């Protein structure tokens, strides 16, 4: 799978795979 770290919602043909931690926050892992 191939993945981004996304600022916002995932692309419609990617699915939310899990979470990036950046400066502890969190953002959407999203992968296709």
């Not at 600022?7 to 999203?30: D, K």
Request: hydrophobic letters at 20%; a positive charge; one cysteine or more.
């Amino acid at each position: 799978a191939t993945c981004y770290c996304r600022t916002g919602r995932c692309a419609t043909r990617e699915s939310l795979s899990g979470v990036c931690r950046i400066s502890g926050r969190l953002y959407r892992l999203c992968c296709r």
